[PDB]
Structure formats: C-alpha cells, structure tokens
Amino acid sequence: SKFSAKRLPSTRLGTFLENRVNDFLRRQNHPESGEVTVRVVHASDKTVEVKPGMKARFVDSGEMAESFPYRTKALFAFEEIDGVDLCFFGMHVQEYGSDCPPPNQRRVYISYLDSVHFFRPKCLRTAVYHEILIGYLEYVKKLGYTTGHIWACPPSEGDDYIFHCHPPDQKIPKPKRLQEWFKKMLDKAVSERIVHDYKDIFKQATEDRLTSAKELPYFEGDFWPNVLEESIQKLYATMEKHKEVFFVIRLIAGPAANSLPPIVDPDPLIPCDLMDGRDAFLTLARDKHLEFSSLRRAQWSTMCMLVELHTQS
Ligand SMILES: CC(C)(COP(=O)(O)OP(=O)(O)OC[C@H]1O[C@@H](n2cnc3c(N)ncnc32)[C@H](O)[C@@H]1OP(=O)(O)O)[C@@H](O)C(=O)NCCC(=O)NCCS
Ligand SMILES: CC(=O)Nc1cccs1
C-alpha cells in the first residue's frame, strides 16, 4: 500500500517506542510475531482552564494559575499480520512541561488508552502493551518529566474509548483486574529502574502532606476537577474511596528532580484534526462504519484509518 502504517511520518517518540517493542519481539523469537509500527499522529498545544468554583476560590486570590498549558499527543501501534497492517493499540496523552505552572509542572497524564485484541501471537499481547507503556514512561523520564498519572477505569459495557465496535469476545476487564494489570506494568518498570515508585492518589497526597485542593494536579477531563467543583477534608474522603483507580507514578525523585534543565521535545507539532482527542475518530468510524470487531473488519478499518491519516485535509 502506498498508504501503509510504516509510511506515516516518523517521530522520535514513535521510533523510540517501536524500537523497544520490536527488540522485545526479537528476544522472544516467536514465529507468529510481525513487525510493530508506532506512529504519533497528532500533537497540538492546548490549555486546561480552572473551573468556576476553583477559580473563585484560588485563582482570583492569586493562589493558583488560571489555566495550564499542555501538549496533547495521539499515538497508535500497528502489527503487520499477513503483510497487512492491523491497528491494535491507541493512546492519547497530556504532557505538561517545564514552563507549566505548579501543580502541573513536568507531569504526563494518560487521557485514554484502548486496544483491539488481534495481536499475534496472543501469548505476547499483554507483554507488548506493557512494553509500549513502559517505553512511554522511559521516554518522558529521559526528557525530564518527573511524574506520570494513570486513571484505571475500564469502559462501561458498549462504550468504546478509542476504537469503534470491539470484538464481542474481547472481554472487558473488571476494575480489580485492570488495576492489577497496571501494577504488573509498573512493577516491571520499577525493576528496570524507569519508575522510582508509585502510589495511589490518597497515599500520595498523605505522604505529600497536601492540605489544599490547589495542590492537586489539574488535568483536562480528569475526575478530580469535577469533584472539586461539587465540593464547592470531604475531598480526602473521596480520594480514599476512589484511590485504587488513580496511580501517581514517580519517574525522577529527590534532589535530581529540582536541578533539571528545561524540557526540550525534539518532535514538531502535528496538526491532524481527526486525532485531536478521541471523539473525532469515533465519529468518523461510527459514520463510515469502521468497526474493529473481527480480524478482517479491523484490517479493513485500519486501512481506511490509514488512508484518512495520509490524505487529511
Ligand atoms: C487495557 C487493555 C489494553 C488490557 O488488555 P490485555 O493485556 O489483553 O489484558 P486484559 O486484562 O484485558 O485480558 C487478559 C486476559 O484476562 C481476560 N479477561 C479480561 N477481562 C475479563 C473479565 N471481565 N472476566 C474474565 N476474564 C477477563 C481476557 O480474556 C484475557 O484472557 P486471555 O489472555 O487468557 O485470553 C484492554 O483490556 C483494553 O483495551 N481495555 C479497554 C480500554 C481500557 O480499559 N482502558 C483503561 C485505562 S484508560
Ligand atoms: C489529580 C490526579 O493525580 N489525577 C490523576 C489522574 C490519573 C491518575 S492520578
């Protein structure tokens, strides 16, 4: 195909992730594995605005920035199966750099991740997802982001985070399973000296000696900004109750976290309105019936998705 995944423009981030995954695959040496291609298909500058209640309380008094700048990225992984691309993994992230005001400085937030379970061989699928995620943490660490933030909430039945119409026998993990799955990924990263340690949001706030909501990171679309608006101590109660779902991941700790030079992202902006957050691709897939429910349909949908990405106005 003149519209292959591999022909999508390369990025340092995508190159870094795909090389990590394919090196994992070379080590495993399984006869059914096919080459993985990771492409960043959207990167744009955004700002998240403090909502009214929090603004009135902390912004207007000069205690908190009014908004926080970030870059959003969308990336996708593809495996070559039978000389045909298959998109099997996607993620959108929010990256708050070194000039972003506290509390958000040098943090990354994983907005959404999703998958379609046709990776071959099946016995390496989870392992490959973990390699992608560990790579992403490794990469942002190298650039100088200090902390990663992951929300482990599975989609409710019939809801698709990124890919329209999942396979009917692709089970959706319960929250306990997904939380353990993230722990498994983070433990591997700990072993590899990528992650220093990780904590749920309640344990984090406690160890941080947080006493004011103005000190919690404030991300676009996250649970916490909405919780904070309703509130306007009871907050600490709500952090305890939902603590299992919210991982705070320390990449760089202690003194080496405060002497850092500015973060320099070597990758350019990538305008792609189709991939500016998850809604537009779901809308396109719903309208054009790009389903991901069987290997065959997913390959066809992948091919259509690729054509769109290559031919974007
Ligand atoms: C998160 C995700 C990528 C992990 O996929 P994965 O590595 O294959 O891990 P899962 O936990 O889904 O599946 C592993 C195994 O547990 C099984 N399993 C999953 N959910 C299950 C359930 N509710 N009951 C019983 N078994 C289940 C799977 O069938 C699979 O079994 P197998 O590999 O022996 O066939 C995938 O579940 C997914 O795309 N989920 C939807 C998106 C999402 O939850 N995003 C979360 C954070 S934004
Ligand atoms: C405020 C906060 O830490 N939000 C989080 C989002 C995801 C994991 S932790």
Author numbering: 1286 to 1517, 1582 to 1662
What does the paper say about this structure?
P300 is an ∼2400AA multidomain protein whose catalytic core consists of bromo-, RING, PHD, and histone acetyltransferase (HAT) domains. It can also acetylate itself, as well as other proteins, and recruit a larger complex of proteins including transcription factors. The overall structure is as expected from previous p300-HAT structures: a central β-sheet is composed of seven β-strands and surrounded by nine α-helices.
To improve homogeneity, a construct omitting the autoacetylation-prone autoinhibitory loop was inactivated through mutation of residue Y1467 to F: p300‐HAT‐YF‐Δloop [K1287‐Q1663/Y1467F/Δ(L1520‐L1580)] and overexpressed in E. coli. Blade-form ternary crystals of p300‐HAT‐YF‐Δloop with CoA and CPI-076 were obtained at 4° C from 200 + 150 nl microseeded sitting drops with a 60 μl reservoir consisting of 20% MPD, 0.1M Tris pH 8, and 7.5% PEG 5000 MME. Despite their chemical differences, these new allosteric compounds bind in the same location, ∼8 Å distant from the active site, between the α5 and α6 helices. So though these compounds are AcCoA modulated, there is obviously no direct competition for the AcCoA binding site. CPI-076 is secured in p300-HAT-CoA by hydrophobic interactions and a hydrogen bond with Asp1507 and also creates a water network out to Arg1392/Ile1486. With CPI-076's measured HAT-domain IC50 20 μM, SBDD efforts focused on driving the biochemical activity. However, derivatization failed to improve the compound activity from this starting point (data not shown). The related compound CPI-076 had no measurable FL activity.
